[PDB]
Amino acid sequence: SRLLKHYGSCKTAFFCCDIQEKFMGRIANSANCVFVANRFAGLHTALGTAHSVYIVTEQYPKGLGATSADIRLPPDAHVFSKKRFAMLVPQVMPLVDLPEVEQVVLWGFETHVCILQTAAALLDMKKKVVIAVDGCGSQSQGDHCTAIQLMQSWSGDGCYISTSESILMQLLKDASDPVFKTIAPLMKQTHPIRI
Amino acid sequence: SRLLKHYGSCKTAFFCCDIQEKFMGRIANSANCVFVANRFAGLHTALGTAHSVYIVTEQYPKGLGATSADIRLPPDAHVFSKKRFAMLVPQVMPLVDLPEVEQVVLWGFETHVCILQTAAALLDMKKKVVIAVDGCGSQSQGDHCTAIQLMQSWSGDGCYISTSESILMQLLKDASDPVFKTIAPLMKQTHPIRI
Amino acid sequence: SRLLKHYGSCKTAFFCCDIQEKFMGRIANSANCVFVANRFAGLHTALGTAHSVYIVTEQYPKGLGATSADIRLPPDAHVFSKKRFAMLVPQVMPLVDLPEVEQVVLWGFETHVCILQTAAALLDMKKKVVIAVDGCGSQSQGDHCTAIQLMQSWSGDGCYISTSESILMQLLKDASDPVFKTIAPLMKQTHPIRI
Amino acid sequence: SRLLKHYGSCKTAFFCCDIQEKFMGRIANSANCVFVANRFAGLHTALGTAHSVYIVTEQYPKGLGATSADIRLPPDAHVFSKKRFAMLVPQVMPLVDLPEVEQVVLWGFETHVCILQTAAALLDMKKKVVIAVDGCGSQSQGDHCTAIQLMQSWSGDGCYISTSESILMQLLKDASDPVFKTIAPLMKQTHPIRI
Numbered sequence A, B, C, D: 001s002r003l004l005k006h007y008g009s010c011k012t013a014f015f016c017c018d019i020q021e022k023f024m025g026r027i028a029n030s031a032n033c034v035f036v037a038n039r040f041a042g043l044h045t046a047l048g049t050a051h052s053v054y055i056v057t058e059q060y061p062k063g064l065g066a067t068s069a070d071i072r073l074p075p076d077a078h079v080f081s082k083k084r085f086a087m088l089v090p091q092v093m094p095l096v097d098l099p100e101v102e103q104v105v106l107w108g109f110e111t112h113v114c115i116l117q118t119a120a121a122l123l124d125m126k127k128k129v130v131i132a133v134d135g136c137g138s139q140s141q142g143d144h145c146t147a148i149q150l151m152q153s154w155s156g157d158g159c160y161i162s163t164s165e166s167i168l169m170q171l172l173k174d175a176s177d178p179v180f181k182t183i184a185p186l187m188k189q190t191h192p193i194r195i
Helices: A030-047 A111-124 A141-152 A164-172 A180-188 B030-047 B111-124 B141-152 B164-172 B180-188 C030-047 C111-124 C141-152 C164-172 C180-188 D030-047 D111-124 D141-152 D164-172 D180-188
Strands: A011-017 A052-059 A078-082 A101-109 A128-137 A159-162 B011-017 B052-059 B078-082 B101-109 B128-137 B159-162 C011-017 C052-059 C078-082 C101-109 C128-137 C159-162 D011-017 D052-059 D078-082 D101-109 D128-137 D159-162
Touching: A011 A030, A011 A111, A030 A052, A030 A101, A030 A128, A030 A164, A030 A180, A101 A111, A111 A128, A111 A141, A111 A159, A111 D164, A128 A141, A128 A164, A128 B141, A141 A159, A141 D128, A141 D159, A141 D164, A159 A164, A159 B141, A164 A180, A164 B111, A164 B141, B011 B030, B011 B111, B030 B052, B030 B101, B030 B128, B030 B164, B030 B180, B101 B111, B111 B128, B111 B141, B111 B159, B128 B141, B128 B164, B128 C141, B141 B159, B159 B164, B159 C141, B164 B180, B164 C111, B164 C141, C011 C030, C011 C111, C030 C052, C030 C101, C030 C128, C030 C164, C030 C180, C101 C111, C111 C128, C111 C141, C111 C159, C128 C141, C128 C164, C128 D141, C141 C159, C159 C164, C159 D141, C164 C180, C164 D111, C164 D141, D011 D030, D011 D111, D030 D052, D030 D101, D030 D128, D030 D164, D030 D180, D101 D111, D111 D128, D111 D141, D111 D159, D128 D141, D128 D164, D141 D159, D159 D164, D164 D180
Parallel strands: A011 A052, A011 A101, A052 A078, A101 A128, A128 A159, B011 B052, B011 B101, B052 B078, B101 B128, B128 B159, C011 C052, C011 C101, C052 C078, C101 C128, C128 C159, D011 D052, D011 D101, D052 D078, D101 D128, D128 D159
Antiparallel strands: none
16 A cells, blocks of 8 residues: 555554653754644544554663653553664664554654654555655754655655645545544644744 | 556546545645646646546545545546545446556545555556656645655556656656646646745 | 766767847847857867767748747758658758667757657657756747646656756766766856846 | 664775865865764764774865865875775775775765765765765865765665764664763764854
8 A cells, every 4th residue: 555544444642752841942843843743643543442552762862861741642652662763673663563554654753763763664564655744854054954855766666745634534535434523623723833 | 658658648547535524624734735736637628538538536525625626627527435545445446447557646634544555555566656746745745755765666557656747747757748838837837836 | 977978978969949130129038048059059060970960940931930039050061841740851851860869959949849848759759868958948938838747747758857057067077087078068158137 | 774884794894985175175074074074083983993994085185175174084094095986995995805805984075076976886886975064065065065965865775974973873772882971072062153
């Protein structure tokens, strides 16, 4: 499939990469990355545990802080600490290394480090991975842009770049879907910084 | 063929995606999307039913309104209502699921939802699909741009992104073509918003 | 080979597409397209007929005028009239449909019509084709940009987009090449409009 | 592997292309290209000769000057003169034409000439090559941009475009890596010109 499959077709993991306190003042669009984390949290909660898993990593939180308090994590979020840049640490693997978890929606900090390397690692596991660019950021725009462009060249192998609104509507496919009415209000919310 | 074939080689479907009243004030370049709808309407009428079919969808028109009144639909336009985001609903399938209808010119609202998903669905049917970017739009520029870029990565499989003027001249191939004189005035018309 | 081969490896055709009087005031960067035509004219003359052929087309010159008088065509330029948008008309074919003419440097007007369609036609003939983007233009920037982007997606099949200076140095490969001293002054000339 | 392998997996060559005195005042972002040369010099010295080789070329230094004095070359840098545009001259080949030297980090002047042609030559040798775009430049922005875009289309074959910070963290993979503490200060240094 070139786009995400419908949420009932397979299970989807939402990978929230290192959106932590010490990055908030160093990544220009941090506020959108929080917004996207909240949007996918709301989606995940609407889809339910039959269809969605929400995975959060924190890079060295002793030094870099917890996940931003502006994110309202779902109550069943799985949160892990790491020093590896890719999110695919041994505690995460039993959550995604299952044949039913076919596709990962990935976003966070930093685009050219943890996000990039996570996408690559997921491609090595033969998973579909969709970057939500509007929820990604780096400390410099050039680092971010060049990495997005790198990931856009991997479409052939199952990694592509999309936006959170496109991702929501990819998973649903049809306004008559039973969860549409529940999800529709998320798309009426506006990014804090213009996209 | 990497570009559209000449109009006599196969039949071409013009897919006008959801250019409806309630989007007109929410999609910045809506006026160009109407302009492109009118340009392809004029082309379709010049080519005739031997070579062209014009298909319009409206997403939930009870809520989102009819197709914009600024569009002058051809008298033989096939207009359908849908809730599916992709245009390939059961009423549309007998119009395009024919071996002679090899290529679809696709444009409208919104780039990252209905247009994107329609392109993907057409690629699944092994059709050639050409996006007229100058007739596409989203409520946010970021959603639109990222989706265009996604579709530009699918060239290998028969989806590429072009403009209405390029599309017209792709179908004709030569100024001595019998319909050129009829079509040429369409290209002298100017987009309402600068491209 | 991914780039142009060295000029002695095979013969190179310079395709100067329709840089005519009536377009000069309608294509914003027309002055650069003339500049690029002159640069390649100088290169062609330095390489000699052993290694280079210079082919000019004019689209309906009765209506659109001759090739711009600001271009100093080489004395052995082959100039042809056409109504086909692609340059590969029957009079041109005996100049390029030879196994030694492996690669074509292509530029001119308009990017999304004659240039685009010529590239496609050359790809059908299994030739390498390199677009000199700095010598290409359209009446609208959007038409031009979208077509360049389309052609950049065809790299896999032997069409890529480069610039005239890059093209010169691709053909030569080494400053100790016998023609370098002759060609070097062309690269010191400055585009009339900043690139 | 789609990204650079970890530094212990194979040996990495840092190719510093022609960052010479006479270009410094002619390439707008020359100061960043020096900065990137220094960053990779520091990385190379931290990794050691087991894992890294630093190769510098100078194009006709009699005419174009030495490598910029603002670059602090490592004491074991291998520096060579050339007239070939590609860096893969006979003196360089015994440094990289070894099965252990699997990947080259490439940057310098000019993007559309020596850098471009070096990437192509390395691809011919079946090496992985990663362009550090933030350390590349040309005398004109258009020449540089178009060449970067050309190289971004070669990802399928083992050439991609990244940034120096992304490259550093690709080679390391994990903050608990023994050299991280040594390398981390390099990433806290700021480019002289905003990226």
